Amino acid sequence: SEAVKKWVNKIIEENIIAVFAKTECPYCIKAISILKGYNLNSHMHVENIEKNPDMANIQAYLKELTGKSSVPRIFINKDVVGGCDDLVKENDEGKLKERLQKLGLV
Ligand SMILES: [Cs+]
Numbered sequence: 001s002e003a004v005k006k007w008v009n010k011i012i013e014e015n016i017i018a019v020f021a022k023t024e025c026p027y028c029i030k031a032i033s034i035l036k037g038y039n040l041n042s043h044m045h046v047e048n049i050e051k052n053p054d055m056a057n058i059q060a061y062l063k064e065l066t067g068k069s070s071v072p073r074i075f076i077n078k079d080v081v082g083g084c085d086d087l088v089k090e091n092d093e094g095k096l097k098e099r100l101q102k103l104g105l106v
């Protein structure tokens with residue numbers, strides 16, 4: 001399905017911070033809260049892919065792009081950050097702030 005891929009691509013390309021998430025997902029909530037703590041709201045988009053008829057196609061494409069089908073799936077300026085554990089590692093080790101600095105976001 002080209003439509004699904006194009007839809008996912010538009011979300012990633014039109015938002016510097018793009019998070020694919022689902023309902024009642026604690027690690028989604030944690031990752032989003034961490035990102036909002038950098039005052040990134042204006043350049044963030046969160047897409048709930050569970051409330052979507054094509055969830056499985058979206059997840060399969062996210063796995064093709066990132067290696068995992070699970071949510072949260074986090075992209076920053078089209079680069080794959082990964083899941084919430086990946087975000088926590090980057091945040092604790094300073095890489096997240098460097099990412100955001102290079103983008104003029106921090
Ligand atoms: Cs912060």
Ligand SMILES: [Cs+]
Pocket residue numbers: 041042043044045
């Ligand atoms: Cs937003």
Ligand SMILES: [Cs+]
Pocket residue numbers: 091092094
């Ligand atoms: Cs930090």
Ligand SMILES: [Pt+2]
Pocket residue numbers: 044045046
């Ligand atoms: Pt949005």
